[PDB]
Design a protein around this nucleic acid. Structure first.
Ligand SMILES: [Mg+2]
Ligand SMILES: [Zn+2]
Ligand SMILES: [Zn+2]
Lengths: 50, 99, 1342, 90
DNA sequence: TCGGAAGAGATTCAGAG
RNA sequence: UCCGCGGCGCG
DNA sequence: CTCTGAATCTCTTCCGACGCGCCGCGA
């Protein structure tokens, strides 16, 4: 959706933001999986344990 | 924001400032030095006299541009007359010479 | 209009001002509210100032132009245009005089010093506090005697009506009208020639010249006291309506009304015969009111309104940054302009900017009206307006037709240097963002985080021709500050090229052979080989042959696929070797520069555009990106930090045992932490920078890593070793707000989390830096304004002045390091003298040759060590500089054209980098060479060493070709282990000295005998019971007895017979005095060898302030004293704190005496033969004295050296020319030592041009010419010193310069740039220059 | 369109003199209406004058002699007109 | 109706008579 | 159609 | 022991970026 220039990061030393990006990819990851786990309409106990 | 022409101020006869008044940008003194660094005299003269402050020269310019002739006629910046009147009112006599 | 030639200024005679006015205003009324009509005789009385409306009589008698130019009978209003309201001035007439506050309060009281009166007395009379006296011969009371009230009554009750006494206004008016000018002139000059006191002499001279100015202007001095006061026209002081029917009154109207009210009150109290004290109080109030009107706040408490703010008087309308001069005369607002947020557009060619359609329509609406009527689509302006406001698409077609070749100007505030304004040929885009080409955006200093930019459209065709020829970005490739190109890529472009040219040891398709770069491109795009793969390729290149033809060559070369791809765009003529390496930013910069020198402008422009396109495309295809795994942390770091903390614990416990002082404990801890931090940084760089990968044959091999952040740093695209060090290595020490370093460094890097303490202490530096830049911006802007004001007059006015004078250029070397090679310092300058091939008499380079790159290369080949070049400071041109003295224009590459304004270029070139500046015992040879002594006298001893009596000698290490390599200053009396001319090698000790003492050297062997000394009076008998052996110490003037005062302790050397040996070369005995508090190791009567010593002696600021002080000609606080005369130093009388030194000339009959302080260490021992300009005592250096002693070249070299030193320390490059020009501008004022047969008075300040011309004509008719000395006034004073009083009034201290010009009767010819900019005619520079030449010929014809 | 004028500046030497000459040439081309000496290609009088001076067909002295001959033609027309008026009177 | 630098004026100290 | 003063705000 | 000049001290004045944008208020 949005393309950012990487060259700014080392010179501004906003390393933390890169970490934020990684967490984002992780977060939606779980969402995606749980979304699919909901879409297949399986037993709620499985998603509960997940 | 952009202004071809519009209102004009009372005392200085210069164009108004700011977006709300639909005024023009300010050709600050740094820009004047920039022009002086080039040999670009004519555009400087046009910037000061006709586009800005000549109460009749800009009318003539508007006429000629509408007519499609890019002539120019530099009069005198009215702010200069304002400065002269204020200096005279101060009690110091100042006047032009070799008319 | 009026075609005036000059402007004249003088005092206002009351009859003159009354002649101006079309009527008197006598009542305070302003405007009726029943009907919005002025009151008669009021501040807006139409009967005086004319009608409020065009040809409309106040009474309504007449309404149209049929009666144009007639006066209504019912009232005195005239049937005319409203414009007259702007013109006509009123007048008011006072029942009493009033001192004009300017002439009183100005820093020298012009009236006061004219009448020699103290300002306290003048104010005490003018403010109605005391009487003053005018004398009659029957009374002892003299004239101008101050008179208090009790003295007034005492005098009047015995001598009433015999003398006369008056209050300030009338008394001063009568006194000024009751004095003659010539009698006081002659008495003042006779007193001047008879008196001696320099204070008295300077006061007398300034009075003499003031009286001369008054007589030559013919202005009657009493006019300084007003009697009739002008009234500013109503329109300049408008009364403006408000919401609810209210009106904002301009403060000037209120001040006028107050003065009118006080005048009316005084006149009423006079005409009804009020008592004395009442009318005195009223007239004092009236005087105070006039003071408020002119210059409220100039004296005492300022007047204020209901808002509790001081009202802006007339003077405030011209003073200050809100003043009329700065706000409106310069820096006008302009029509036909727009502003918008900028945006990257990569698809643009170099010379075209993307301009939103709406702005284009608005700006060119007049042109659209014009063309639309011309093509017959619209008949009347109303039709055109309604059509364009409906956007009938034909208007869009017309709009696309109009702008096709119509350049526009783009400007970014602040316009730090002239690149800040550039010209572009527009292209129309939907949207609302102005699109720039990134390359020029780099030059703009702009970014894209939200910076706005303003666009102006030129109107006339001459203007747009100027914009195309001069300003178009395709012309501004070379910066004016230096010859290197300004159009240089950065960020993604450089990253892409770097990736494209980097090779790897093993890649897809390695080793194959390509018949041409096209096949390389095919194999890459088809995906059968990666860019990095190394391959052999057949390539053709070309070279500019001896005739100028591009002779071809074709060969096989080893390269990379990426390198061939890049080569394919390279234009013909450049060698292939330029590409065949990992291209960084600097490589691309030099590639563009070599393209521009080898080929023309247009191939370079096309090359730049192609570079930008290809770099962007291949960077995008690269997909370089930064990830958290990239910032590898060297695993050694934990071990190194544990080691460092172990050492910290060790030193801390060592202090716990009391073995060391706390300060050295701190120092040791700081040192070990710094060492550990450096070790960690080295480990991090080593681990990151290189990595191991398998080769083609199946073995591991090292290569430069493709780690992303490292690739970004190494390419030079962005970042630096410091930022990488902080990202991965430990970031190290940080400073407390006082600048002291915290003992515990920040150990965690940025990748790991910083604890709260580390973060908090780190914030100190962050807020320090932000405040630093916030403050620095203002100082930089101010400094630039100054430099511009000083240098704005200077314009190239002739081709060649014919001066053989010049300056000597040598490479700048300090401490054995060549800080600046000769090629940079001499490139583009004209030879003042013919350069000879070294070691021969053959002419290598002829005189008056512009040294371009080939000449510089030739100089390097022959190893020329010094050149002589023409300089701006040495040019003989009057009111300008010749083209040959200035030399090569950085922006164009050839000799500068006539008519260019250079001073402004120099001022901006100095100012712009200022934003970057910061603001809050033995000698070892470094390398091979030969030892030479610059200026030395040496004596050799029984130890085989050499000891020196020159106090300012320097070793210089010389190349075998005669070029210098190293140079180092050597202190007095240092010991040397080598003779002159010996060979040296790196690390070789050649000389030694004790820095902690000052020795005294005896040149000849003999037997010491104490002379002119007595123990306990001049010297005391130290026996160091607490230190060691016996010694003798000279008793200081506070410790010595009176018998020790005239007796100066000394030792003579005697032969074996006890006879006093003479100095080997002079009639002076070999006598060596012991200075105050001197220490000697040897007792009376011992032998000492030749060249042996016996004496023991007890022994930074920010860049921007330093440059400010240099250009302001600041006197340093501890000025070193240098020999004003060539002679022999000699001692003499003594007094408190100061020693009466004397220099006695060798042949001259005129000794000189100086009050040298004793607390400064003297470098003189009563035997030092000295010459003019030689250092007598060290310290900071005063530029004025340097100029006096060693001339213009010395001071210009000093200034340029200091400024270049600070800038090079920052790393910015500025050519010397821009400093030399400022120096020449500083150096205008001269002073006259004898007039010869000229009319000039002695001691007068005269502009150097005037005195030069006068002397030249005076000798042209054979008379004795005048003689002069030149004075280095600071740039502020030098700018105020100019004759163009208009420019001075524009700059600073407006009231002072206005008063000075007024009393002087000055006239300004309007010859500089600023004056013409004010007036609005063409400037006498650039394209305007030609217009003036014809004019001056007509003025010569007139 | 014109990427750069540098060749024309090389021909005239002084850049500012180039601006003046091109200005007067464009002035007379626009109001005087005298036709370009070279093909126009929907360009503007400015770049037209720049190309013309680039070709060396137009230069300060060339303008001088053209103005001289135009003045001579105008004065010849004036003299022939007044002679015709005199012949009408006679 | 706030600190710094420069200039001018005033006061004090040293040298010479 | 307007002189500002104060305030934040972005360069 | 006194007078004048020079030096030092005290007091007053000047300066301390360019550009846009909104809000309030206005005896
Ligand atoms: Mg920005
Ligand atoms: Zn009337
Ligand atoms: Zn010269």
């Amino acid at each position: 959706d949005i393309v950012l220039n990487p060259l700014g990061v080392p010179s501004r030393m906003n390393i933390g933001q890169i970490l934020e990006t990684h967490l984002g990819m992780a977060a939606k990851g779980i969402g995606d999986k749980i979304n699919a786990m909901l879409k297949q309409q399986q037993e709620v106990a499985k998603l509960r344990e997940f | 924001h952009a202004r071809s022409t519009g209102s004009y101020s009372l005392v200085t006869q210069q164009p108004l400032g700011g977006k709300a008044q639909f005024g023009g940008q300010r050709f600050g003194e740094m820009e004047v030095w920039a022009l002086e660094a080039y040999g670009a005299a004519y555009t400087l003269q046009e910037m000061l006299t006709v586009k800005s402050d000549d109460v009749n020269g800009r009318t003539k310019m508007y006429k000629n541009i509408v007519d499609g002739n890019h002539q120019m006629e530099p009069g005198m910046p009215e702010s200069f007359n304002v400065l002269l009147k204020e200096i005279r009112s101060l009690g110091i006599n100042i006047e032009l010479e070799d008319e | 209009t009026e075609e005036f030639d000059a402007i004249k200024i003088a005092l206002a005679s009351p009859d003159m001002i009354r002649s101006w006015s079309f009527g008197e205003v006598k009542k305070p009324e302003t405007i009726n509210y029943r009907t919005f009509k002025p009151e008669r005789d009021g501040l807006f009385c139409a009967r005086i100032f004319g009608p409020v409306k065009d040809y409309e009589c106040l009474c309504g008698k007449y309404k149209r132009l049929k009666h144009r130019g007639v006066i209504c009978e019912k009232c005195g209003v005239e049937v005319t245009q409203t414009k007259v309201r702007r013109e006509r001035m009123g007048h008011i007439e006072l029942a009493s005089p009033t001192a004009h506050i300017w002439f009183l309060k100005s820093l020298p009281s012009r009236i006061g010093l004219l009448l020699d009166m103290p300002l306290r007395d003048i104010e005490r009379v003018l403010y109605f506090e005391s009487y003053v006296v005018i004398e009659g011969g029957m009374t002892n009371l003299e004239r101008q005697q101050i008179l208090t009230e009790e003295q007034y009554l005492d005098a009047l009750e015995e001598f009433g009506d015999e003398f006369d006494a008056k209050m300030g206004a009338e008394a001063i008016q009568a006194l000024l009208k009751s004095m003659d000018l010539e009698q006081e002139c002659e008495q003042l000059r006779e007193e001047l020639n008879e008196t001696n006191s320099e204070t008295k002499r300077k006061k007398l001279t300034k009075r003499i010249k003031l009286l001369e100015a008054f007589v030559q202007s013919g202005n009657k001095p009493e006019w300084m006291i007003l009697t009739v006061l002008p009234v500013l026209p109503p329109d300049l002081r408008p009364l403006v309506p408000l919401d609810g029917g209210r009106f904002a009154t301009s403060d000037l109207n209120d001040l006028y009304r107050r003065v009118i009210n006080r005048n009316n009150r005084l006149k009423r109290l006079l005409d009804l015969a009020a008592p004395d004290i009442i009318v005195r109080n009223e007239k004092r109030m009236l005087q105070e009111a006039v003071d408020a009107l002119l210059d409220n706040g100039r004296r005492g408490r300022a007047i204020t309104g209901s808002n509790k703010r001081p009202l802006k008087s007339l003077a405030d309308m011209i003073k200050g940054k809100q003043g009329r001069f700065r706000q409106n005369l310069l820096g006008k607002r302009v029509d036909y302009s727009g502003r918008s947020v900028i945006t990257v557009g990569p698809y643009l060619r170099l010379h075209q900017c993307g301009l939103p359609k709406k702005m284009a329509l608005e700006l060119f609406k007049p042109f659209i009206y014009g063309k639309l009527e011309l093509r017959g689509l619209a008949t009347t302006i109303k039709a055109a307006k309604k059509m364009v406001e409906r956007e009938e698409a034909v208007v869009w077609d017309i709009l696309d037709e109009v702008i096709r070749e119509h350049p526009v100007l783009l400007n970014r505030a602040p316009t730090l240097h002239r690149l800040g304004i550039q010209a572009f040929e527009p292209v129309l885009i939907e949207g609302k963002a102005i699109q720039l080409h990134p390359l020029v955006c780099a030059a703009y200093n702009a970014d894209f985080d939200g910076d706005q930019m303003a666009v102006h459209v030129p109107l006339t065709l001459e203007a747009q021709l100027e914009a195309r020829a001069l300003m178009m970005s395709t012309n501004n490739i070379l910066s004016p500050a230096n010859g290197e190109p300004i159009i240089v890529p950065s960020q993604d472009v450089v990253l892409g090229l770097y990736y494209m040219t980097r090779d790897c040891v093993n890649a897809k398709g390695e080793g194959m052979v390509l018949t041409g770069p096209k096949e390389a491109e095919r194999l890459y795009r088809s995906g059968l080989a990666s860019l990095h793969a190394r391959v052999k390729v057949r390539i053709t290149e070309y070279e500019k042959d001896a005739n100028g033809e591009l002779v071809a060559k074709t060969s096989l070369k080893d390269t990379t696929v990426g390198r061939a791809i890049l080569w394919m765009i390279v234009p013909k003529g450049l060698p292939y070797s330029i590409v065949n390496q990992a291209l960084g930013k600097k490589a691309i910069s030099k590639m563009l520069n070599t393209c521009y020198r080898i080929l023309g402008l247009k191939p370079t422009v096309i090359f730049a555009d192609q570079i930008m396109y290809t770099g962007f495309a291949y960077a995008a295809r690269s997909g370089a990106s930064v990830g958290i795994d990239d910032m590898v942390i060297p695993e050694k770091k934990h071990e190194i930090i544990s080691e460092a903390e172990a050492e910290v614990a060790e030193i801390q416990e060592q202090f716990q045992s009391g073995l060391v002082t706390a300060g050295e404990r701190y120092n040791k801890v700081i040192d070990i932490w710094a060492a550990a931090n450096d070790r960690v940084s080295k480990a991090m760089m080593d681990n990151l920078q290189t990595e191991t990968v398998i080769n083609r044959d199946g073995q591991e091999e090292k290569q430069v890593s493709f780690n992303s952040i490292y690739m970004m740093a190494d390419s030079g695209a962005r970042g630096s070793a410091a930022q990488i060090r902080q990202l991965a290595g430990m970031r190290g020490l940080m400073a407390k707000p006082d600048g002291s370093i915290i003992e515990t460094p920040i150990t965690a890097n940025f990748r790991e989390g910083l604890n709260v303490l580390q973060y908090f202490i780190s914030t100190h530096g962050a807020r320090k830096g932000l405040a630093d830049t916030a403050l620095k911006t203002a100082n930089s802007g101010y400094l630039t304004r100054r430099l511009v004001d000083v240098a704005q007059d200077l314009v190239v006015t002739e081709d060649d002045c014919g001066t053989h004078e010049g300056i000597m250029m040598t490479p700048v070397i300090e401490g054995g390091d060549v800080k600046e090679p000769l090629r940079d310092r001499v490139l583009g300058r004209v030879t003042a003298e013919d350069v000879l091939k070294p070691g021969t008499a053959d002419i290598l380079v002829p005189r008056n040759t512009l040294l371009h790159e080939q000449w510089c290369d030739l100089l390097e080949e022959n190893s020329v060590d010094a050149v002589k070049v023409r300089s701006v400071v040495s040019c003989d041109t009057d009111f300008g500089v010749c083209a040959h003295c200035y030399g090569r224009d950085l922006a164009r590459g050839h000799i500068i054209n006539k008519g260019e304004a250079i001073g402004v270029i120099a001022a901006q070139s100095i100012g712009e980098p200022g934003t970057q500046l910061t603001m809050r015992s033995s000698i070892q040879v470094k390398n091979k060479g030969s030892i030479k002594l610059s200026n030395v006298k040496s004596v050799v001893n029984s130890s085989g060493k050499l000891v020196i009596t020159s106090r300012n000698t320097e070793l210089k290490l010389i190349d075998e070709f005669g070029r210098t390599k190293e140079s180092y200053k050597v202190p007095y009396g240092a010991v040397l282990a080598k003779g002159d001319g010996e060979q040296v090698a790196g690390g070789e000790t050649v000389a030694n000295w004790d820095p902690h003492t000052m020795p005294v050297i005896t040149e000849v062997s003999g037997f010491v005998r104490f002379t002119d000394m007595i123990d306990g009076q001049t010297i005391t008998r130290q026996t160091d019971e607490l230190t060691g052996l016996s010694s003798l110490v000279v008793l200081d003037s506070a410790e010595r007895t009176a018998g020790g005062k005239d007796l100066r302790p000394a030792l003579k050397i005697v032969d074996a017979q006890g006879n006093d040996v003479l100095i080997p070369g002079t009639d002076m005995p070999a006598q060596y005095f012991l200075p105050g508090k001197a220490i000697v190791q040897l007792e009376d009567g011992v032998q000492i060898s030749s060249g042996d010593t016996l004496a023991r002696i007890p022994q930074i600021t920010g860049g921007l302030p330093r440059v400010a002080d240099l250009f302001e000609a600041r006197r340093p606080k501890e000025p070193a004293i240098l020999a004003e005369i060539s002679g022999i130093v000699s001692f003499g009388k003594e007094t408190k704190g100061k020693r009466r030194l004397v220099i006695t000339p060798v042949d001259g009959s005129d000794p000189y005496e100086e009050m040298i302080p004793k607390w400064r260490q003297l470098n003189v021992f009563e035997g030092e033969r000295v010459e003019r300009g030689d250092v007598i005592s060290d310290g900071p250096e005063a530029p004025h004295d340097i100029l006096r002693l060693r001339g213009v070249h010395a001071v210009t070299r000093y200034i340029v050296n200091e400024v270049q030193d600070v800038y090079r320390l920052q790393g910015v490059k500025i050519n010397d020319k821009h400093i030399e020009v400022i120096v020449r501008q500083m150096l205008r004022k001269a002073t006259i030592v004898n007039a010869g047969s000229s009319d000039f008075l002695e001691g007068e300040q005269v502009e150097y041009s005037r005195v030069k011309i006068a002397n030249r004509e005076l000798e042209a008719n054979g008379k004795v010419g005048a003689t002069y000395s030149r004075d280095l006034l600071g740039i502020t004073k030098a700018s105020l010193a100019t004759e163009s009083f208009i420019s001075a009034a524009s700059f600073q201290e407006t009231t002072r310069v206005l008063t000075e010009a007024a009393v002087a009767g000055k006239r300004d010819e309007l010859r500089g740039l600023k004056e013409n900019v004010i007036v609005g005619r063409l400037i006498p520079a650039g394209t305007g220059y030609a217009y003036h030449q014809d004019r001056m010929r007509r003025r010569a014809a007139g | 369109a014109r990427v750069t004028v540098q060749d024309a500046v090389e021909k005239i030497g002084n850049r500012f003199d180039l601006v003046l000459v091109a200005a007067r040439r464009a002035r007379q081309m626009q109001v005087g209406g005298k036709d370009p000496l070279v093909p126009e290609e929907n360009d503007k009088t400015t770049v037209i004058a720049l190309r013309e001076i680039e070709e060396g067909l137009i230069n300060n002295q060339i303008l001088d002699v053209r103005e001289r001959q135009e003045q001579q033609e105008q004065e010849a027309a004036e003299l022939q007109a007044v002679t015709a008026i005199a012949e009408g009177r006679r």
